[PDB]
C-alpha cells in the first residue's frame, strides 16, 4: 500500500533519491533493450550470452499435438496405480499381474530412472526406453506397446 512506500519517506528530500548530479532524466541510454551490440554489450555479453544471431532450422507451421509425449520414470510407475491395487499385488504372489496403462495417466513414454520392486507388472505404453524395458523385465514384468 502507498502508506508503507519509500515515496512517503522521500518527502522533503529534494532529489527523491535520484541524485543531484545525474538526476532522473528521461531515457538516457535509450528505450527498452536497444543497444545490446553497442553501448549495452558489456551487459548482454555478461548476463545474456547467446542473445544475438541465428541457430538451427526453421520449422514452418509447428503443431505440437503429434509431438506430445510426457514421460514417467520407473520409480513412479507403482504410484500411478490405486492404493487398493498396490496392496493386492505389490509384494504378493498372484496368478494375474496388474496392468499399468501409462497413457491413461497422461504419459507417452516410460523412462528408466529409478528402480522397481520385484513383482510382475504389465506396462502398457506407447514408448519405452531401452533401460526402462530391461528393468521391467528383470522385475518379472513385461512391456506391451499400445497406440
Amino acid at each position: 500500500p502507498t502508506h508503507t512506500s519509500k515515496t512517503r519517506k522521500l518527502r522533503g528530500h529534494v532529489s527523491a533519491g535520484h541524485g543531484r548530479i545525474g538526476k532522473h532524466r528521461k531515457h538516457p541510454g535509450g528505450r527498452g533493450k536497444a543497444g545490446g551490440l553497442q553501448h549495452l554489450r558489456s551487459h548482454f555479453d555478461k548476463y545474456h550470452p547467446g542473445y544475438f544471431g541465428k541457430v538451427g532450422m526453421r520449422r514452418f507451421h509447428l503443431m505440437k499435438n503429434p509431438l506430445w509425449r510426457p514421460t514417467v520414470n520407473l520409480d513412479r510407475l507403482w504410484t500411478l496405480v490405486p492404493n487398493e491395487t498396490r496392496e493386492k499385488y505389490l509384494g504378493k504372489n498372484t496368478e494375474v499381474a496388474p496392468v499399468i496403462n501409462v497413457l491413461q495417466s497422461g504419459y507417452g513414454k516410460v523412462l528408466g530412472k529409478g528402480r522397481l520392486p520385484d513383482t510382475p507388472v504389465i506396462i502398457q505404453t506407447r514408448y519405452v526406453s531401452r533401460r526402462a524395458e530391461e528393468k521391467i523385465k528383470q522385475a518379472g514384468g513385461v512391456v506391451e506397446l499400445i497406440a
Binding site: 555479453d45 555478461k46 548476463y47 545474456h48 550470452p49 542473445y51 544471431g53 538451427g56 504410484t79
Partner: protein, 186 residues
Amino acid sequence: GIDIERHHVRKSQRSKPASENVYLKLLVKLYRFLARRTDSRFNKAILKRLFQSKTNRPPISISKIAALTSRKSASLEGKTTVIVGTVTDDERLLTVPKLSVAALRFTKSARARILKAGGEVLTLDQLALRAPTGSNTVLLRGKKHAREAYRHFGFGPHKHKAPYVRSEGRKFERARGRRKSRAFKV
C-alpha cells in the same frame, strides 16, 4: 577523536522470527527458556532455526529421513529425527519404515504414511518434553541450495549457471556468445 574501524559492528542474525504466527511465538517462548537454562547446543540450534525464513528452512522428505537414519554404520536405529521445517512425502518410497520424527509441519500424506507404518509424529513441544536437551536425537536439515534461484546465482562468463530466459529452445540465448560457430563460447 578515536581511530576505530568498525566492520562487524551490528550482528547480522535474526533475534526473533519475522512470522506473526502466534503458535510459532509460543514455540520460541519454550525454546528461549530451554536454550537459556540448559547448556545444550541442541536447544540453541532449535531456537536459532525457529527464527529463520522459509528459504533458509527447506523441507525434507521421509525418504531422506529414512536414508539418513539407515546408513550401514549408523546406530541411528531407534532415535527421533528432528527438523525445524516441513516433512514432505516421497511417493517413490513404496514401503515406509517405522520412523520417529519431530517437525514443525507434516504434509497430510507424510503424516498418514508415517503413522500407518507404525511410526510417530511429534511437534517440537512434544520433542522438548521427550528430549529436553536433544539427547539421542538426529538433527537434520533440508537442502538449502535446491531452490531455483541457486541455478542462476553467480551467472557469468564460464560460470555454467542458468540464464534468466522467458522461453527455452533455439532462438533463446543459444547463439553468438554461446557457441564457437557464433563468434565465441561464453
